[PDB]
Symmetry: C3
Subunit: 336 residues, 3 copies
Amino acid sequence: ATAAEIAALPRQKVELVDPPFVHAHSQVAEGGPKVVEFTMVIEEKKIVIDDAGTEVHAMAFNGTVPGPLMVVHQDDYLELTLINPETNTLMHNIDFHAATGALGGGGLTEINPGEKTILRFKATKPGVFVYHCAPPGMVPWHVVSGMNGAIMVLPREGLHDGKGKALTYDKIYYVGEQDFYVPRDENGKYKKYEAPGDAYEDTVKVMRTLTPTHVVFNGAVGALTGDKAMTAAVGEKVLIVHSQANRDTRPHLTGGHGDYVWATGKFNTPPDVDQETWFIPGGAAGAAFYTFQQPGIYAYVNHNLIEAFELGAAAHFKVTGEWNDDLMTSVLAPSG
Amino acid sequence: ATAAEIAALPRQKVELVDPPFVHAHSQVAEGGPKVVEFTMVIEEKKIVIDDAGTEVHAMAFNGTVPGPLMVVHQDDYLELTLINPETNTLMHNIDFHAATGALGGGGLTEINPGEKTILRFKATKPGVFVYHCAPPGMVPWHVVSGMNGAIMVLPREGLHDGKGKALTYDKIYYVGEQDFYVPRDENGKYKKYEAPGDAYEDTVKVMRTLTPTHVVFNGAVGALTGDKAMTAAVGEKVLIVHSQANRDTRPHLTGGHGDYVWATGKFNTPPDVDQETWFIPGGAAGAAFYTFQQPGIYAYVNHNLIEAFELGAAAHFKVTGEWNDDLMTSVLAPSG
Amino acid sequence: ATAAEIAALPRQKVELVDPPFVHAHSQVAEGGPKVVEFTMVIEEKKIVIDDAGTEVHAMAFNGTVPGPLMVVHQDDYLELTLINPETNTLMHNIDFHAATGALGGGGLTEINPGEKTILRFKATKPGVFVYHCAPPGMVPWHVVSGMNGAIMVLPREGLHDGKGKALTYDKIYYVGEQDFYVPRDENGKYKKYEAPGDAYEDTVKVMRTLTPTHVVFNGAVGALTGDKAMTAAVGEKVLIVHSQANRDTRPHLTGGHGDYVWATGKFNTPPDVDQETWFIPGGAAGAAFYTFQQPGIYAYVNHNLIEAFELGAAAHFKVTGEWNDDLMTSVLAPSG
Ligand SMILES: O=N[O-]
Ligand SMILES: O=N[O-]
Ligand SMILES: O=N[O-]
Ligand SMILES: [Cu+2]
Ligand SMILES: [Cu+2]
Ligand SMILES: [Cu+2]
Ligand SMILES: [Cu+2]
Ligand SMILES: [Cu+2]
Ligand SMILES: [Cu+2]
């Protein structure tokens, strides 16, 4: 496409929503290629990641950890206006794994506090992809401070299984998983810092142990539980997009399965089926499609159970509906 | 199927055998759907896991680590009678990744010492699946204390390759891999405790380092070596089921390959082929099919070689038969 | 084939080249099966792996870490003459994951300093496979001292995508990833030794932490960056072979993708497509095919960014050519 052809394409401004929710979209593309516009303001902010009150100086796209999920269709152009407010103290940029060229856009979006930039790229490949900040010389520090999210490039014909059958979800959730490396004092208590830079040296030492102190979903231990638990109903089809920009994860839906899982997150790669626990390598996004068949509470975890239950990588689903005794039944309840 | 139809299905009791061996079964289903009955008694007991007398208070399904492999066919029902003797001290339950609903059966099988329960679930998805204990609030502790195993849900038509050609094995082995986190005193000596609970705090601390003190097959260093090596003969087809309920592993048959490997453990997902080293994520089981071509000793390991040779994740196969010089030959033996 | 028949096959002597380059070869087999000859001298030597002058007592095949890539075609025979100089201090051998029998050849190639051996095996399976030293009792120590490499067994008809379309690369690079475990003194300073054996005890202690002190490409931090960056031009098809003999890795081409990725490293297993970040388990090799579309610098990393940017797992590609504004463009460059 020439500049003239691209300038002639229709444009659509999209309002982002906070994870785990996803902004309104159409699974099957409506019309021809478009330039989909998004705007995100970067916020360096203090966030609490656990019930004890542990703090992290987060570097957050759109003010959240993970950054929001942007949705477009194959061959659409994603045009992101990225803003680094003067209240911030560090330079930031953005690397879209979905993009081609200049370190994913990273080489063209380096903005200092008080600057903004507009990057446009063609979403040539379908799938879910990670996006993350990556300032030369300070790459992992920004990523493990929460500066990452994901986008979904849907095929123009919507999702299909490995054999051509269409797969239409009723709802979609985006679960961003984050590994945090929080310094501790001699009492084993987590430390607090006045400014983000003050935490750098202590944090890098923890990062080098390759052992996170917290592994969480949606930015905090228990963030997707209670009134914030995800929801579904028996018979409902749910797509769960999951990303980890720096470290491996192994998603599992307790009491369920991944009926179709694009473990690599790429739609042209046939999905695995009937999965118990799938694997998403650090630096990637994956997606699982499931039709709930049983009501009740489900846990959704990173299946290194220590990471799930001790470090924080566990969410819940509340599912409404009728119990199916054919699928499962207590023949004899716990008794003497 | 209707209520009467399920109640009318034949019921069959099966005697279990301890890993790495597998109970009597047919690869191709015999007759229509059946309710296959198994019984397992939970045993809390101290076991020695290395050559230094290191102890672990194991929580063992059927008295073994891993728990035994249960085999059924797709759409059969698995009806487990689970017993928790009054001599035990903790509440236990069971979560079948192969099942649908109630946290895999966990929400319906919580039994205190002195209680038993009977759970039935329809094995709707074909493949090998992990099962493990999962008491709310203490999930990883029970799992990393050895309370996990696996089941195999064979397709009613038996196994097939990607082209639909039948794959029939001569023998099957089940290798359960267990990551242990044993506390040490300040002098580096592994600690011993009177009761399981006494070790809880110390153990969780080691678990949080995400660094196991031991990684073993069949419950101990060297359990599947020497006089306990698994066996085969040239020309024999062997299925090796491998599980890891809490942590990633990467199986490798030294001197062989995985001709067909259902790396995700699910039979409707086409098997990878000609594999050197496959990957099984924590929280899942995988299965490899190999036809032996050379006699001699083989090592079967988790290919992070430190885990295999320093931590304990190494087994052996002793294979009989004639050597094939076409496949391999020493043209010039070691000489000065 | 009989001994006589093999004896009558044509023989071709190959001259090996140091990584990341690969020796001359033809993608499509030239003629019928042949006995491809390779010779490698083992060199125990000191290598400096970081800018702090940190030393490792390398055990290097052909004098490099990783050892060089050997290329043959399916059903050719690979005949390796392995030499252990009298100047070396340890026994060494070689295990080809591509081979069948005698522990991959390890049991037939144990050579003391001053000895040599000749091993021949039939390359029956197509793909990239790891090869590494494995002396009984000291297996991981030699592997994490850099004694590993890989070989590529090309289909006789060259590479093809999942549907049969031929995939022909213009260039090929071999990236060997190495996890190193360097002991430190009380002040956190890396220790130096005057003999491989002297560091054994101290190194095993670090190895047991399963936490490498360094993770590098081609033997050292920066080995494949700056001036030693790999090169290509817009429009060129490049195959990147990557191996890790002991620990998992997750390759990512920053600003690009893996158009076709044989993540398991095996050619009869259809490749995944449109990959952002792929996964290679320790003990295996993988291969990605990509056609460059944008010029500029590309980072190629292990996407656990701490491993890439703190521990050393990062390489560069320098690509020439014209920028494509359709694929990506800076609508508004960084500005106030
Ligand atoms: O899904 N927790 O075992
Ligand atoms: O399978 N040992 O490298
Ligand atoms: O691919 N570097 O984030
Ligand atoms: Cu940033
Ligand atoms: Cu990246
Ligand atoms: Cu239990
Ligand atoms: Cu589970
Ligand atoms: Cu060696
Ligand atoms: Cu090996």
